[PDB]
Design a protein around this nucleic acid. Sequence first.
DNA 1: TTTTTTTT
DNA 2: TTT
Lengths: 99, 100
Amino acid sequence: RGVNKVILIGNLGDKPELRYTGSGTAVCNMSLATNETYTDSDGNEVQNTEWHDVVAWGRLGEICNEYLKKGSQVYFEGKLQTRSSTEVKAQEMMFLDSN
Amino acid sequence: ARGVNKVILIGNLGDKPELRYTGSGTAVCNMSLATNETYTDSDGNEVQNTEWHDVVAWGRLGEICNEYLKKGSQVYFEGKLQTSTEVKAQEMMFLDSNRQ
DNA sequence: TTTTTTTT
DNA sequence: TTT
């Protein structure tokens, strides 16, 4: 009855932080920086870093906590949602950090 | 691009769009959009999940939103996340126009 | 806080 | 669905 999709490509601001709920469900909280770089009206470069709170639950949360490092380039697809603040609940994750 | 920040929403406004102007006279339109999701309970019961989103449209797009959108209007939005967290609308489609 | 009409 |  509705579409709620978010797509993010950027780098992690810090190591993923894995926690567990009272019910023992894995929750992984992450900060992703998407960088927009644009020259403005006076030919002056301006860098505008957007920070995003990304949340991964269950297996995906633990996979993220295992393989993702501070500064890792990563693709995320998920839902927009607000809880407790506004966050992206990850549904898909793709490593873009290969060598 | 040095990054990808893309948001896509289909939903219904919860209220009339609200348009205001900045000190520079630039049109700013704020909206509240709802995306509904329905699933089944542990007991198999229907359970509605609703997410509300603050959507902002600037300039001409902001005026077009204020001009055609109303309470309950079904609408497609496409934009970027900005953080208070907001979806800045870059693209909009009125979905209650050509339904059949 | 507030939205949803045939239909998954 | 869920810190």
